[PDB]
Amino acid sequence: GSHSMRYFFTSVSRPGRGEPRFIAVGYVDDTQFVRFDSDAASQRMEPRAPWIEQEGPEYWDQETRNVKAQSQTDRVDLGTLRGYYNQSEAGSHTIQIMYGCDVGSDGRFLRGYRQDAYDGKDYIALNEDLRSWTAADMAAQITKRKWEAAHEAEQLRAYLDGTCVEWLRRYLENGKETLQRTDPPKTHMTHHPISDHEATLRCWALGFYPAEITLTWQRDGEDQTQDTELVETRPAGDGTFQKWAAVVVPSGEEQRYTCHVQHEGLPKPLTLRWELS
């Protein structure tokens, strides 16, 4: 199927407690392969996947310089954005950045992206065409004007639909033996009385990949949305995900309910029913 390469950056100011905390993480699909943490012992970009360890000293020297350059940029941008948003020097603030590219199963470029946030809200994003920007407000528009004048979109595009694609293809070839593949969910239902008259029916989906999944509950073929308890999809810690959806039902009425599982690894959407007797 399709694949992605993404770099995630978080910089958090610590007024009067030193320089900002900076954490960078590189992923191929949902697999971390590199990391940098300003609070870590090495002060270097570090390998996190077995297939990246084979990279040479010049690779690690370059990744370290370049991740440190992003850290320094965020440090000055925290001061700049505090100015744009008219905030004091006392509070802690956050810059988040994500950029990357997607390729098809035949290695072809599909899309590139860059999104930036300030204090957990949109700040600026590169558009789908890789030529223009969308600023979230009037302060972020100051950055957009600076990047339009600097022709930043062209420079960034050369990386997103170029360099990013070249290296993502190399990493996919280098990690082909271990990289997580599509795995359909293993599904089952559990039954938990909450009293003498009611029970929780819990529909489980385990060991699946990708994380995208839809769990729905129906009472007599009619949707149960607003009565369903859905948990956030969560990591098993092995590269696959888990999720459950629950409904509180009257005892004796279990068979009226159906759980519906939709996933890209399944040939057909599944229907689960609690069958009593």
């Binding site: 350059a69 600097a150 360099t163």
Partner: peptide, 9 residues
Amino acid sequence: ILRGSVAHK
């Protein structure tokens, strides 16, 4: 690999 050029805001 990461970008080799950075943009100030």
